[PDB]
Amino acid sequence: HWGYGKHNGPEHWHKDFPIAKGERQSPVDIDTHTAKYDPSLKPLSVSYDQATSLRILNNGHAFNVEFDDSQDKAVLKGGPLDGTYRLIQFHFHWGSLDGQGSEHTVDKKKYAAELHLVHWNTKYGDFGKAVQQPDGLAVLGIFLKVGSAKPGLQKVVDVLDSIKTKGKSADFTNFDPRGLLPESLDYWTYPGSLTTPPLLECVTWIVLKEPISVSSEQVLKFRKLNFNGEGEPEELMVDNWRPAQPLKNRQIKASFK
């Protein structure tokens, strides 16, 4: 099926998912000089103080920390969003070396990794119905650079040894996503898509300007994961990022002057 290699990677996805060549695909390069400050944007509200993580899973493309989204507990609102969006999962994209890994780029700059906190619009009842709507999803994207360690990430890092290969999953309760956020909530925002197949165009992207720093040891543990299942030839899970796509007729707004 689909993946990140020469024969099933991003340049091949359009064959099974022709939306891959659509009009609002993600990620994109963020040209910081053509993004315009929008004063009509309300402050962004990230309310994670009562998030309930459940499980961590290696799906063969990344690892997902999945949350209990059956009540309003961890919500994104404000900024470009109408109403309330509920956190369902987070995951990362990363490279084989620190010089690549992010999906969005900033004036063509690639970061070592990118965190995606995935939320669905509560007006649509749940995730499955939300991905049938052009405003069904909001993804909060956070860049990762290599430097000082991020303490709030270590609990994720230390569990990866238990989910090395595709299909493995583990209990993962009481993880606090607030420990993954940078100081500033300055952001860019634009309408786009899921960056993995089915590549559905239902996402309001909110990409934070300030990256978080993680240590080399932490990202190296990310790179010890496997794309393959147990008992198959080992393919290290690295470079699971889609390259930037045509902006076409879209405007990126800045939340800051």
Ligand SMILES: NS(=O)(=O)c1ccc(C(=O)NCCCOCCCCOCCCNc2cccc3c2C(=O)N([C@@H]2CCC(=O)NC2=O)C3=O)cc1
């Ligand atoms: N990186 S990121 O952006 O943050 C990011 C990226 C991704 C995510 C994420 O959530 N991914 C998970 C994706 C969830 O979406 C799934 C939506 C699925 C929609 O339904 C598919 C239904 C398929 N059925 C069809 C459809 C059309 C035609 C046919 C059929 C079908 O069956 N047949 C026959 C029938 C019977 C049989 O017996 N044989 C056959 O052939 C057909 O003729 C989150 C964040």
Ligand SMILES: [Zn+2]
């Ligand atoms: Zn993603």
